[PDB]
Symmetry: D2
Subunit: 106 residues, 4 copies
């Protein structure tokens, strides 16, 4: 799906996780976030359209997705161990990654 579509999926699921009561709700939302982040990997954002695809900007753009994907991987291990409150707080650590990439490229 397109970069904005993936960002809506990330946004909607981060809010689901915040409001969640149980591990099943949290696991399902993190699974959707993992798929959206992986799908966004290859996107070129509008502000980097005129850069070479090998520019340090596009390199640093993709580095943000490595950080986000790694954080979702850990949050899912914590949810699958039944540590719901820990998985929810780990989902809050995602916000810094969201903000760092937005600050530079949104």
């Amino acid at each position: 799906a397109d970069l904005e579509d993936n960002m809506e999926t990330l946004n909607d699921n981060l809010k689901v996780i915040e409001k969640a009561d149980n591990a099943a709700q949290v696991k399902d939302a993190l699974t959707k976030m993992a798929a959206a982040a992986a799908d966004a990997w290859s996107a070129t954002p509008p502000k980097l359209e005129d850069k070479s695809p090998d520019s340090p900007e596009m390199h640093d753009f993709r580095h943000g997705f490595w950080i986000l994907i790694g954080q979702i991987h850990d949050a899912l291990h914590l949810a699958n161990e039944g540590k719901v409150k820990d998985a929810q707080e780990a989902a809050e650590h995602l916000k810094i990654t969201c903000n760092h990439c937005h600050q530079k490229y949104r």
Copy 2:
């Protein structure tokens, strides 16, 4: 690209990294492998075609791509700090990951 397409990209670029004589050749191959791994995220392999998407078999299948994506992340940091022998030796690491997923799911 379909799973088989992404796999040929991973296979071709893993070979380039083993044969490479300079950092630019390793970096280019690692970047292509990262794109192929992220794009493979969404695929259902033939052995799991009749498993539900949000099943445990599909969760366990996708976990191998988190491992691979993390190994490519590290290899690219080694290549970009000029440690090209070290970056190439990351290939021995990636191959174990390739082999574990194939043993279970191919």
Copy 3:
């Protein structure tokens, strides 16, 4: 060094990274933080002093050091590839980790 000693090292070096003007100053501070985090691995904090060592509370306590050590690993790769603004911004990432463990266990 005891836990309190390691914590002062983490606190002092996190400040150096925020104030740093060059890569060498950030790298030196990150290396000191990595040594302090690894050395804190073995500590039993006051709130868990009466929990068994191989208990779940102590496992959950030590998991925060895996997160911190992983964040310092990435920040040092960013500093060593010359991305010093990016390396300093890793401080916002580390501080979340500091705060999550303190909220639960301090």
Copy 4:
């Protein structure tokens, strides 16, 4: 404890994991390996005694422990999810890391 003492702990526990039948045996051994790797962080190996502590050799020596500690972190998540055979195979991925550091520094 000293570097050789930590290496005996890593060796003995890697063999325990290989021979293990259940998740409790695997979890206990990985926990011991996590403590030994963290304790070995700050060691200077005999072959790098005459190098500066900031040499790229000592930097690359410590990088191996980041890789090992990360791999033990994942293996423990897999054991705590009850995926015993996956945790055992993840423990086998440690061998490449063992060999890469030994090849250079043992």
